[PDB]
Amino acid sequence: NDVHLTGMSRIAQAVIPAGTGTDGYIVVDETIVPELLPRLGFAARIFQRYAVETLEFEIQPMCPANTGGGYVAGFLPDPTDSDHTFDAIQATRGAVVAKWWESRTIRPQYARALLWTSVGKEQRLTSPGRLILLCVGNNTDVVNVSVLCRWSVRLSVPSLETP
Amino acid sequence: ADAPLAKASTITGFGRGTNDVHLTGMSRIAQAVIPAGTGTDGYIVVDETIVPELLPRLGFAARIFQRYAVETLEFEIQPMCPANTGGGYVAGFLPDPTDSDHTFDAIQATRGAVVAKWWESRTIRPQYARALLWTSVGKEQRLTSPGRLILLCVGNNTDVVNVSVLCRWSVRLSVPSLETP
Amino acid sequence: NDVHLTGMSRIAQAVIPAGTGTDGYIVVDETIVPELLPRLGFAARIFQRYAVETLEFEIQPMCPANTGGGYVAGFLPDPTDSDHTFDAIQATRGAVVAKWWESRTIRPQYARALLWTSVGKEQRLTSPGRLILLCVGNNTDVVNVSVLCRWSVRLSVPSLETP
Amino acid sequence: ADAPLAKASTITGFGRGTNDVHLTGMSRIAQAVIPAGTGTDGYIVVDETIVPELLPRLGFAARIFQRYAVETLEFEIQPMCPANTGGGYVAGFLPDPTDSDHTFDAIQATRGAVVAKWWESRTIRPQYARALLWTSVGKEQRLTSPGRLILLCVGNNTDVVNVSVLCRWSVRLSVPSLETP
Amino acid sequence: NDVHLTGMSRIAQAVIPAGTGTDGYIVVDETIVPELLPRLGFAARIFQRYAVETLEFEIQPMCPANTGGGYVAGFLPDPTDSDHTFDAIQATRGAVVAKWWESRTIRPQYARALLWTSVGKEQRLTSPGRLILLCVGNNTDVVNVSVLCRWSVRLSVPSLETP
């Protein structure tokens, strides 16, 4: 009928050797589809329609304190296929920027419409935006960032997919 | 008075032992060391169930009583290395005393799980079972241990790390007996 | 649906010749399973789950007054397979000790959980403890002890076993 | 906030165990049997010191704590034979844990000593040391055991007697530790 | 007749090269006898009986901040000859644990009886416990710990020893 899930889950993880990662180097650009969240990924294989109530992100990077580069992150509510720059992430509401040893918190501005789980011909009805984390400095040592999520959603209309 | 065939036994208070105790404290669980280079993501540092044996003052006092019920139970991680390490860890608490959960996704999912770098210590406020368990061993594990602690590394540490997890327990042992371990 | 039985029934009976029965000699060690009580044995072949409300024991030994040994009894809420000594029965709540011509009353401390009737892989869910009656003296003549019970239980969830 | 060389260890409650417990109960001390004809006057039936080992639930709980202080301590004799025996006994309690008092005159002299026939049971309300002792063994005996129980026959019994002495103890173990016996 | 001394004094000092000192490695295990404290050592060669009023310890380790091991300490009021482990120090009241660059404060639970100064056949009457400081990590560089004390005592009954 109608549920209300919470959770906290890894979205993605990337590793960067030294020398790589000038300004504008995209570390991770992935849309918020149910296939990426693990516990919602098993729960959106049941239902059909969900609507996010609150949704927040944390970056949680892991490097020694002698790194001396930095990152920027944001949340773009166009799930298009072209925003690869610093200035699109500058404009948005709830963006963060810090050095590589510091964790910050993205409090985005989502859509609060009512979406679908499966794929379709239109992209705007199945994912409420994109996360983009791109390096702004030029790092010294190997970093290892591990972005988290904090999702709360209200899945309904029971079915079953065959992915 | 006069003299019968046998006077009755005057053992008055027989089998009237103590009933309710409250033991608290803090004791470690386990401790390991990892050389440099070893310890990629998913490498299990420590996985030891909370049986009353690993808490040492409780295990000498649960050999008397039969049943215990954990009132408050918290954990502290305390890694020991300078701020030039740069790997990380993830800690959790899984109330299954089963034998297959070895991934980052299972540990992050539970309630009150933490993740931090090797030069930073965190604190677990877990979701324990709050039931009333047994002390002696048996065939089924789900009645004698309120879960497992699993701690595993997530990065690739640079120097030698040295973690030492602890445990702040409080319990209310009752129903007196004495067993043989 | 839900019943409430009472009763009073023989658990076991043993006989001891002269010379036998030093201290620590087990006369009867049997768990409280429904197969031992007679009227509950016919009634727990119907239902599946029972929960004891009140349960008490009496020893009722029968010997002439020139016996001059004694016994101890108790109730151990571990239905394990190893407690054969005096000191495990010493510790428990509601133990008794008297000479062979005297009856005493065990008022135990049971579990008040909700158990099963049939057998299973785990022993703790099918029997709320053990009765142990062991001689503490070194008797003179032939005794004949006959322990009783006084059980009250609330059987439910109807089925039928095939023992 | 900013990033230092090493964050301080946040182990908050370390070494804050329980302090005061009160254990009571009843447990036997020893038990013997005497054939007919044996057991003239002065024959020692039972002579065993009250070390915490002979009380079995206390000995599994004094392996934690360091010091105990006996609050109340009483004894019950309970012989088992019919009224055709006609010998006797004498019971006492000597607060020396030494090793030479084997006569009727030493046992009758103490406070709260009893004497009766074999078909009658009595009760000892002794004069214990009421100090604050230790639990582990050492060179000196006078700091770890609050006296001895000595019971010996006084007549010449006719049939087989069978005595079974008991002990009603209550104690207040404290100052937590853990030893190795 | 009766005095009241205070003070602050070195108990012991040890040095540990790199590689040595795994978990359970005893750095210093010495009883609190008057022969170890310096100012009380000259004052307990006068009198015979003392009784500690307040007595506290500090660890004061000295190493660069890149050490990354740690220690544990405590106070065991058995002056026996066998407690060499972590778990005996875990149980006691007023134990401390920190990394090698950090000083902590032991506030023990002593005996407050009235003791002797000289040696004797029994150990329990001449020393109110033991200090045990043992490494719990596996250190990187050379540390140099220097434990202190803070003793206050009330010596009496004048005599003179010949050690």
Here the CATH number for the domain that contains residue B180 is 2.60.120.20
Q: Tell me the structure's resolution in angstroms, rounded to a single decimal.
A: 3.7
Count how many domains chain D has.
Answer: 1
D chain contacts of residue A101, beta-carbon cutoff 8 Å: 3
Contacts of D64 in chain B (CB under 8 A): 57, 60-61
Contact between residue A68 and residue A100 where contact means Cβ atoms under 8 Å apart: yes
Query: Would the CB atoms of D11 and B56 count as touching at under 8 Å?
Result: no
Tell me whether residues D82 and B10 touch, CB distance under 8 A. no
Distance CA B40, CA A5 (A): 32
Residue B1 Cα, gap to closest chain C Cα (Å)? 20
Distance CA D44, CA C37 (A): 47
Domain that residue A73 falls in: 1-163
Contact B56 E91 (CB under 8 A): yes
Cα C157 versus chain centre, distance: 25
Q: Which tokens in the block code for residue D62?
A: 């004094």
Strands A25-31 and A130-135: antiparallel
C65–D82 CB contact, under 8 Å: yes
Which H, E and C letters describe C68-133, residue by residue?
CCCEEEEEECCCCCCCCCCHHHHHCCCCEEECCCCCCEECCCCCCCCCCCCCCCCCCCCCCCEEEE
Q: From its phi and psi, is residue D61 left (phi > 0), alpha (psi between -120 and 50) or beta? A: alpha
Q: What is the DSSP string of chain B?
A: ----S-PPP---S-S-------EE--EEEEEEEE-SS---TT-EEEEEE--TTTSHHHHTTTTTEEE--EEEEEEE--B---TT----EEE--BS---S---SHHHHHHSTT-EEE-TT---EE------S---SS--S-GGGT---EEEEEE-S--SS-EEEEEEEEEEE--EEE-----
Q: Which of A90, A104, A85, A118 is nearest to A148 (CA)?
A: A104
> Residue C43: which H helix or E strand, with range?
helix C38-43
Nearest CA in chain A to D1: A102
* H/E segment holding residue C134: strand C130-135
* Cβ count within 10 A of residue B1: 3
Give the pair of three-digit tokens for residue C155: 């059987």
CB environment D67-92: b (16+ within 10 A), e (fewer): bbebeebbbbbbbbbbbebebbbbbb
Query: What 3-state DSSP class applies to A106?
Result: strand
Which residues of chain B make contact with A39, given a CB cutoff of 8 A? 109
- B155 CB neighbours in chain A (<8 A) are 62, 144
Indicate the SS3 state at residue A82.
Answer: coil
Residues of C whose CB is below 8 A from D28: 86, 90
D6 and E65 within 8 Å at the Cβ level: the answer is: yes
Residues of chain D neighbouring C70 (CB-CB closer than 8 A): 80, 162, 164
CB atoms C91 and B140 under 8 Å: no
Q: Which of D16, D18, D177 to mutate to test the interface with B (most CBs of B within 10 A)?
A: D18
Other CB atoms closer than 10 Å to residue B5's CB: what's the count? 12
**Measured between alpha carbons, how far is residue E63 from residues A68, B115, E140, E142 in Å?**
27, 29, 10, 7
E63-88 burial, b at 16+ Cβ within 10 Å, e below that, comes to: beebbbbbbbbbbbbbbeeebeebeb
What is the 8-class DSSP label of residue A5? Answer: B
- Among residues C149, C136, C41, C157, which one has the least CA distance to residue C105? C149
Residue E46 and residue E56: Cα distance in Å, rounded?
23
**Residue written as tokens 């036994």?**
B9
User: Could you give the strand order of the β-sheet that contains D148-153, starting from the edge strand earlier in sequence?
Assistant: D44-49, D148-153, D89-91, D114-116
C16: amino acid identity, one letter: I
Query: At CA A137, angle to CA A134 and CA A143, rounded to 5?
Result: 70
- Judged by DSSP in three states, A159 sits in coil
| Closest residue in chain D to residue E86, using alpha carbons only | D178
Confirm if C57 and D71 have CB atoms less than 8 A apart.
no
Residue D9, min C-alpha distance to chain A (Å):
19
How far, CA to CA in Å, does A63 sit from each of A140, B155, D8?
10, 9, 19
Cα–Cα distance measured from residue E91 to residue D176, given in angstroms and rounded to the nearest whole number: 6
With touching defined as 3+ CB pairs under 8 A, do chains D and B touch?
yes
- Three-class secondary structure of residue D65 per DSSP: strand
